[PDB]
Amino acid sequence: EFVPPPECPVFEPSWEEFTDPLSFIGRIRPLAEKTGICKIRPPKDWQPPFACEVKSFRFTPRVQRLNELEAMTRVRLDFLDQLAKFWELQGSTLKIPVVERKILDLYALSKIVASKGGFEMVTKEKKWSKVGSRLGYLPGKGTGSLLKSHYERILYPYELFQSGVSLMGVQMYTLQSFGEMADNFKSDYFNMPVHMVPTELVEKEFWRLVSSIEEDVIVEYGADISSKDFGSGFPVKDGRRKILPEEEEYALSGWNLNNMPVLEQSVLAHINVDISGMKVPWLYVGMCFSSFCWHIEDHWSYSINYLHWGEPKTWYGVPSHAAEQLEEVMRELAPELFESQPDLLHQLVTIMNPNVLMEHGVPVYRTNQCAGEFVVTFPRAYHSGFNQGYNFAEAVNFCTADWLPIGRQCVNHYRRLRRHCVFSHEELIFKMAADPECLDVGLAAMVCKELTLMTEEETRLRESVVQMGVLMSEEEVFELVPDDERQCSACRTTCFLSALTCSCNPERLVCLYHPTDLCPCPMQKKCLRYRYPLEDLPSLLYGVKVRAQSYDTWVSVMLEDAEDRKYPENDLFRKLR
Length: 577
Ligand SMILES: CC(C)c1cc(C(=O)N2CC[C@@H](NC(=O)C3CC3)C2)[nH]n1
Ligand code: NI
Ligand SMILES: [Zn+2]
Ligand SMILES: [Zn+2]
Prior knowledge:
This protein is an alpha+beta fold. The protein contains 19 helices and 17 strands. Helix 5 packs across helix 6, helix 16 packs across helix 17 and helix 17 packs antiparallel against helix 18. The structure holds ligand 90V, nickel (II) ion (NI) and zinc ion (2 copies). This is Lysine-specific demethylase 5A.
């Protein structure tokens, strides 16, 4: 019944192309940009050793119930739709909480609580921890008593409402032991050896199982695992280990996912002044039918994923230009609601069968990922997938010159939502502008083109606020304050260039796009806490316009200045020798 989408493109680069990835990825950008994803086969000689010891490697597994893996059931969406219209009636503007790194499933919660008599019944029996069990929350961190706090605040009033009249008050594992499980589970499922079952067949059953209520299937996986804490699958020179010379080659490779975000073409190469969690690889131990839902990268960055070993990983990709198109259809399932909760769209995981997205007009490609193959993902490329069997993957985000203007657009879209930013785009660019040397030229040229657009937009904002009647201007240094203190009250953007603070509260800030929502205290008072007093326009644009127009002139001892100034040497140095 299932309809395999058209396969995504592959690249078998020569050893000479394989030497600078971000330069090799730039080549294939105009082409892969249109499939969203792209597979990459390295030379067959390229076989790095696995640095980790399977037999002594423990991880905490997460569970997946493919039936309730889709969160966008009709019943859940309408449930939430009703719950909000209830609180809008009561004038509270429903707030969805977060628990153990992710949103709470209120539908699931209310269903269960009522399955055992409700709030006061459960309270007078102390089964809140049994609740967190069935909701997949890891004990014994106190989740039980935490849900009670959220239920009573959000659901018990609806419980009474949804109930009779009832309203008077009140209100306001080891990898080794893991393969043994999977390779037994797979075979006993299809009754075959695991390396013998075709891919196309498993793809069929997976999508079958999701929507099949006729049978329930449980599967385990392990994801979002830090390399820092568990170790990478690649060899790296960090003092943990005497490094063999056999491995020396692969430890310095730029295709070692521990070296990517540091390359002179990456953005984070010299800005090791703000940790993000996105300059450090992650580990994804996979099992048959283990699935990840449709998603994009924080700040719309590239993703790159290597499959160290194991059975294949099935992908599904969607190009960038079809992103707004992609979101529109998932939103069609509850328009009234996603108006109230725009970002709740993304807070909800979903595996929308591609056929549907295809029969709604959305480009969908796919590939099977195999041991030793890279999968590269592009900005705003929604992607999903599952794994054919036991395997082990390692993934990293990264950012390139072409990404800069997109990140700027992503904030503007994060600001038009209520979404926190993992770092300040604007902050980043100036950190790059503060060391124009040792900085790849393509960035410089793009930065300038990007930075003037910001100065104008900022100066426009700097003048739009004084008419509103402010007089004082303190100077503050944001890069040294924690993000949670430099965010706007309702944006909620990480502010770095300029914000507005009054004496109404000690530390309560707002973005210059929402200067009114700070506090009713009139703009008569202060304060425009700024960072640079518009003497920056000359200074910093100079250092970068220099190396941006020093290379523009250099082309039109010359082979020496390109050595000292650290210029690229692909086609232009070829004429040298
Ligand atoms: C760099 C980090 C933030 C990332 C991961 C992805 C992504 O899409 N991935 C990772 C592996 C694969 N996920 C799985 O295989 C499931 C079984 C565990 C798909 N994008 N960025
Ligand atoms: Ni991803
Ligand atoms: Zn005030
Ligand atoms: Zn704001």
